[PDB]
């Protein structure tokens, strides 16, 4: 199982530059294709960019570009993330996370979803739209909850690209859902996902006390970018 | 203007404990009821407990008793925070925040709202239900938007208790209303404030691209607590 380990915490002026490595190990290869999500202060998940280092081709989301500078080494399967003119709402949570793309003789296979992600960077700076989701749910044990995700025909709607994510408060996230209804080896089948027109969602049945965490959907998007969910608290009663 | 000054960013094992000062300035009159209040990462704004330094009571949410202990110098005009047995979802940024309670020659006035806001310190920690808001409102602007906030008779519908705040990105909230629907001076009076039953409403007239921003209500209890709102994202469009 390969484990993204990321560098300490860094506490920075407003101005300077910051950068935070994500260390990969334990798999066969040392190419992975890393993205970086930050999640400030009462804020959801944020995608900025990310990178596929055996083609050397990065991607940033347009708040991002000219101010985030994703770079990998593969010598040492090493990603990096530098922000540059750091502001008080850069003070965020930074992960990396990887998307598990597969290569064979006949081309590339993208998998556009956030596999396995490092343990979050805390860097706090000195003095398109998301998803919606309901911000909180509630159910008892052993029932079963469906959370929505609504977006547009640019993102949930165009194609099979939605993704959902299961959060405990100040941990790292974990993938539940890939490809609209597909669950990694894992995850129960107590996870299930789906969608319909511009609206996906995520049912957690046989809800257990366990559970009791936030909920996050994703999808790619026709801008060659992912937009992450409003995030869903689900409480157990 | 009063200010309210905070203690550098910490970053802390899992387990230890961690203290954050807070000193007003900026005032003459007297020492302030304040409140502490956290944002962590993917979470709301969380009303942990509050003081008032000059008739030494202290008030706590469930969640947080015995865990956070908060305490006043009123000779330094200095509020203290101290949270123990740190975890990673202690991981945040900490405000404390004047309630603008006042007194004169015959009594004493509260003012359930948080009127001036410190800075924040992030505490970083090493590698009672909120207030039923909607995630999102988006409108064009000149449309009017109006955000609800959903309690319970022992919070919302108890009392005109009610207040809201807005916060722009990298900064401190600010308050637009407070005891349902007063505005603060300062404050564009196309905010208003609303309540029925169990739920509260913030109106924004003639809606401008700046107030693209977070939303917030909040409510002082029955239990002698406040709790917040789950927070409103307000999309100014095209
Ligand atoms: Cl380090
Ligand atoms: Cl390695
Ligand atoms: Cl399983
Ligand atoms: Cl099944
Ligand atoms: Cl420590
Ligand atoms: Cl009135």
């Known amino acids: 199982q390969v484990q993204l380990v990321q560098s300490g915490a860094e506490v920075k002026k407003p101005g300077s530059s910051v950068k935070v490595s994500c260390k990969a190990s334990?798999?066969?290869?040392?190419?992975?294709?890393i993205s970086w999500v930050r999640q400030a202060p009462g804020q959801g998940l944020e995608w900025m960019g990310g990178?596929?280092?055996?083609?050397?081709?990065?991607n940033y989301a347009q708040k991002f570009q000219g101010r985030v500078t994703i770079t990998a080494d593969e010598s040492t399967s090493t990603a990096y993330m530098e922000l540059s003119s750091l502001r008080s709402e850069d003070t965020a949570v930074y992960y990396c996370?990887?998307?598990?793309?597969?290569?064979?003789?006949?081309?590339?296979?993208?998998?556009?979803?956030?596999?396995?992600w490092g343990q979050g960077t805390t860097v706090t700076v000195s003095s398109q739209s998301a998803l919606t989701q309901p911000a909180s749910v509630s159910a008892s044990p052993g029932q079963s909850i469906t959370i929505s995700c609504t977006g547009t025909?640019?993102?949930?709607?165009?194609?099979?690209?939605v993704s959902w994510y299961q959060q405990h408060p100040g941990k790292a996230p974990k993938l539940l859902i890939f490809?609209?209804?597909n669950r990694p080896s894992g995850v129960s089948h107590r996870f299930s996902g789906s969608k319909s027109g511009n609206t996906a969602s995520l049912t957690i049945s046989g809800l257990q006390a366990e559970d009791e965490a936030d909920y996050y959907c994703?999808?790619?998007?026709?801008?060659?970018?992912?937009?992450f969910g409003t995030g869903t608290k689900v409480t157990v009663l | 203007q009063v200010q309210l000054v905070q203690s550098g960013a910490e970053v802390k094992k899992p387990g230890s404990s961690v203290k954050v000062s807070c000193?007003?300035?900026?005032?003459?009159?007297?020492?302030?009821?304040?409140?502490?209040v956290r944002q962590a990462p993917g979470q709301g704004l969380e009303w942990?407990?509050?003081?008032?330094?000059?008739?030494?009571?202290?008030?706590?949410?469930q969640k947080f008793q015995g865990r956070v202990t908060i305490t006043a110098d009123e000779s330094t005009s200095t509020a203290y925070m101290e949270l123990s047995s740190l975890r990673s979802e202690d991981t945040a940024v900490?405000?404390?925040?004047?309630?603008?309670?006042?007194?004169?020659?015959?009594?004493?006035?509260?003012?359930?709202?948080?009127?001036?806001?410190?800075?924040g310190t992030t505490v970083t920690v090493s590698s009672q239900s909120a207030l039923t808001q909607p995630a999102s409102v988006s409108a064009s602007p000149g449309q009017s938007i109006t955000i609800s906030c959903?309690?319970?008779?022992?919070?919302?519908?108890?009392?005109?208790?009610?207040?809201?705040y807005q916060q722009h990105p990298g900064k401190a909230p600010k308050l637009?209303?407070?005891?349902?629907?007063?505005?603060?001076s300062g404050v564009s009076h196309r905010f208003s404030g609303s309540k029925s039953g169990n739920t509260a409403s913030l109106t924004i007239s003639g809606l401008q691209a700046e107030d693209e921003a977070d939303?917030?209500?909040?409510?002082?209890?029955?239990?002698?607590?406040?709790?917040?709102?789950?927070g409103t994202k307000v999309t100014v469009l095209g």
């Open positions: 996370a990887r998307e598990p793309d597969y290569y064979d003789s006949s081309g590339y296979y993208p998998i556009d979803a956030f596999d396995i």
């Open positions: 334990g798999g066969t290869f040392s190419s992975y294709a």
């Open positions: 990178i596929i280092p055996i083609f050397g081709t990065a």
């Open positions: 025909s640019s993102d949930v709607g165009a194609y099979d690209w």
């Open positions: 490809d609209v209804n």
């Open positions: 994703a999808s790619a998007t026709l801008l060659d970018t992912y937009v």
